[PDB]
Design an enzyme around this catalytic site. Structure first.
Site, PDB file in Angstrom:
ATOM      1  N   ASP A 118      43.545  24.950  17.439  1.00 34.10           N
ATOM      2  CA  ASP A 118      44.767  24.147  17.811  1.00 34.10           C
ATOM      3  C   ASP A 118      45.345  24.554  19.179  1.00 34.10           C
ATOM      4  O   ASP A 118      46.456  24.135  19.530  1.00 34.10           O
ATOM      5  CB  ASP A 118      45.833  24.192  16.680  1.00 34.10           C
ATOM      6  CG  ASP A 118      46.341  25.567  16.406  1.00 34.10           C
ATOM      7  OD1 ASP A 118      46.132  26.485  17.278  1.00 34.10           O
ATOM      8  OD2 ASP A 118      46.919  25.731  15.292  1.00 34.10           O
ATOM      9  N   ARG A 171      49.364  23.894  22.983  1.00 31.13           N
ATOM     10  CA  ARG A 171      49.348  24.009  21.525  1.00 31.13           C
ATOM     11  C   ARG A 171      49.535  22.599  20.936  1.00 31.13           C
ATOM     12  O   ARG A 171      50.436  21.828  21.321  1.00 31.13           O
ATOM     13  CB  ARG A 171      50.506  24.937  21.105  1.00 31.13           C
ATOM     14  CG  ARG A 171      50.727  25.015  19.592  1.00 31.13           C
ATOM     15  CD  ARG A 171      49.499  25.686  18.874  1.00 31.13           C
ATOM     16  NE  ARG A 171      49.828  26.110  17.503  1.00 31.13           N
ATOM     17  CZ  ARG A 171      49.891  25.262  16.453  1.00 31.13           C
ATOM     18  NH1 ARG A 171      49.624  23.956  16.596  1.00 31.13           N
ATOM     19  NH2 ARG A 171      50.134  25.732  15.218  1.00 31.13           N
ATOM     20  N   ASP A 202      48.359  22.779  12.122  1.00 24.48           N
ATOM     21  CA  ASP A 202      48.071  24.200  12.096  1.00 24.48           C
ATOM     22  C   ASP A 202      46.617  24.377  11.639  1.00 24.48           C
ATOM     23  O   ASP A 202      46.270  24.062  10.491  1.00 24.48           O
ATOM     24  CB  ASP A 202      49.075  24.897  11.146  1.00 24.48           C
ATOM     25  CG  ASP A 202      48.994  26.421  11.218  1.00 24.48           C
ATOM     26  OD1 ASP A 202      48.689  26.937  12.297  1.00 24.48           O
ATOM     27  OD2 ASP A 202      49.347  27.096  10.203  1.00 24.48           O
ATOM     28  N   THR A 203      45.794  24.900  12.546  1.00 26.56           N
ATOM     29  CA  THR A 203      44.451  25.300  12.169  1.00 26.56           C
ATOM     30  C   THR A 203      44.511  26.736  11.688  1.00 26.56           C
ATOM     31  O   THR A 203      45.373  27.514  12.099  1.00 26.56           O
ATOM     32  CB  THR A 203      43.497  25.170  13.368  1.00 26.56           C
ATOM     33  OG1 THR A 203      44.057  25.803  14.541  1.00 26.56           O
ATOM     34  CG2 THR A 203      43.183  23.663  13.668  1.00 26.56           C
ATOM     35  N   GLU A 212      43.578  30.632  11.796  1.00 29.41           N
ATOM     36  CA  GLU A 212      43.173  31.524  12.904  1.00 29.41           C
ATOM     37  C   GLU A 212      41.665  31.792  12.771  1.00 29.41           C
ATOM     38  O   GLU A 212      41.094  31.636  11.693  1.00 29.41           O
ATOM     39  CB  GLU A 212      43.966  32.844  12.867  1.00 29.41           C
ATOM     40  CG  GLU A 212      45.494  32.684  12.893  1.00 29.41           C
ATOM     41  CD  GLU A 212      46.028  32.118  14.201  1.00 29.41           C
ATOM     42  OE1 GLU A 212      45.449  32.458  15.253  1.00 29.41           O
ATOM     43  OE2 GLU A 212      47.038  31.352  14.172  1.00 29.41           O
ATOM     44  N   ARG A 227      53.660  27.880  25.918  1.00 35.24           N
ATOM     45  CA  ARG A 227      52.584  26.918  25.685  1.00 35.24           C
ATOM     46  C   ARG A 227      53.091  25.496  25.774  1.00 35.24           C
ATOM     47  O   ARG A 227      54.153  25.195  25.211  1.00 35.24           O
ATOM     48  CB  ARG A 227      51.927  27.135  24.290  1.00 35.24           C
ATOM     49  CG  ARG A 227      51.302  28.510  24.155  1.00 35.24           C
ATOM     50  CD  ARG A 227      50.677  28.749  22.760  1.00 35.24           C
ATOM     51  NE  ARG A 227      51.667  28.541  21.694  1.00 35.24           N
ATOM     52  CZ  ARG A 227      51.412  28.718  20.407  1.00 35.24           C
ATOM     53  NH1 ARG A 227      50.210  29.163  20.031  1.00 35.24           N
ATOM     54  NH2 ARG A 227      52.321  28.366  19.502  1.00 35.24           N
TER      55      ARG A 227
END
Ligand SMILES: Cc1cn([C@H]2C[C@H](OP(=O)(O)O)[C@@H](COP(=O)(O)O)O2)c(=O)[nH]c1=O
Ligand SMILES: [Ca+2]
EC number: 3.1.31.1
Length: 129
Positions: A15, A29, A34-35, A37, A75
């Site tokens: 992401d 971002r 939300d991917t 980690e 970001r």
């Protein structure tokens, strides 16, 4: 909203991506997702998915929402497009990201991404399996 040009500098993970925007390097971002980690289950697959999408694209675009354009980490916060297809939505549709971080004023594409999550879930895909 409107799409603006950017150029790929480097894939980072599921992401985030480093893009040249108005001629300056910045880490973007992906809004509203939300991917995992990289160290988590499906993280490597999320990273690989976004990497292929942005590296294969002849054209990257970024689309800011109506609210904040930088997060507290500096970001860029955007919807990111690769040859017209939105990365954010594509990750969600493949069950490689959840809809997440839905803040007031930066949520233009929320129902689109929700609709994609519902279908990923129906299809028991990846994170949803
Ligand atoms: C997606 C997004 C994340 N963030 C912040 C929230 C989280 O702060 P915290 O780091 O304090 O938990 C962090 C999660 O991003 P990552 O999922 O990349 O870690 O980024 C925003 O402020 N606005 C956003 O739109
Ligand atoms: Ca993440």
């Amino acid at each position: 909203l409107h799409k603006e040009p950017a150029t790929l500098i480097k894939a980072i993970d599921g992401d985030t991506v480093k893009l040249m925007y108005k001629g300056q390097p910045m880490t973007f971002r992906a809004l509203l997702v939300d991917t995992p980690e990289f160290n988590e289950k499906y993280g490597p697959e999320a990273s690989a998915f976004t990497k292929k999408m942005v590296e294969n694209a002849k054209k990257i675009e970024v689309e800011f929402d109506k609210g904040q354009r930088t997060d507290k980490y500096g970001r860029g916060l955007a919807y990111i497009y690769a040859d017209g297809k939105m990365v954010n939505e594509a990750l969600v549709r493949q069950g490689l990201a959840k809809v997440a971080y839905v803040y007031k004023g930066n949520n233009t594409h929320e129902q689109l991404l929700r609709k994609a999550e519902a279908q990923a879930k129906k299809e028991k895909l990846n994170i949803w399996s």
